[model samples]
Target: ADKELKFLVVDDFSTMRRIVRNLLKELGFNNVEEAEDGVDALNKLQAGGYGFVISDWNMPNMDGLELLKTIRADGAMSALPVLMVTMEAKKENIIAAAQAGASGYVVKPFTAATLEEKLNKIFEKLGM
Candidate 1:
């Protein structure tokens, strides 16, 4: 992955956001930002320069599905990878995320290696 690829780590909980921030940094991505919820993320993304999104499933203002759906609908960042990272751990949950246009998923309680796997896998899919 490009070390300079900017990443947005979205979640309502600050601790979770930090956890993801650490994981992303651990994977050699230092240019990362954080958002408290999907709406905040939406605003930041619209400002441009974001290449990836790691969002929580359930949020206060807007949820991950809505976020991914919104991103998928937008022309400017439709293809930008949105990876779900939360406790929505059901086969149906994964299916819904997939159907909603998530580039990849990481069920909650994952560590650095899991994220690395998912990120690399999604990059492979994009041929990047």
Candidate 2:
């Protein structure tokens, strides 16, 4: 994976966002920014330089699925890697996320190892 790749972590809960940020830093990816919701995330992404996104499912203004859909629809960022980190673990939700073009999905209360594995899988698939 490219260590230089910049990441955007989005979640309405400050605690969850902090947890993901710390985990990402531990994974040797320190180039990260925080967004409180999908709307903020989209703004930052449109500003450019974000190579990846880690987002929660539910939020005010917008949600992760909507963000993913919007990104997929945008010609400039259609291929951007998005990893959903949310509590929405229903089979249907997982299917929906996959259908929405998520690069990966992690259920809430996940272990660091689980996150690492999913990230590695996504990078491997993308040849990044």
TM-scores of the candidates in the order shown:
0.96, 0.98
List residue ranges in candidate 1 displaced over 4 A: none
Candidate 2: minimum summed lDDT over ten consecutive residues — where?
1-10
| TM-score (C-alpha, index-matched) for candidate 2 | 0.98
Q: lDDT of all predictions, in order shown?
A: 0.92, 0.95
Residue 20 lDDT in candidate 2: 86
Weakest ten-residue segment in model 1 by summed lDDT: 19-28
Best by TM-score: 2
Name the best candidate (by lDDT). 2
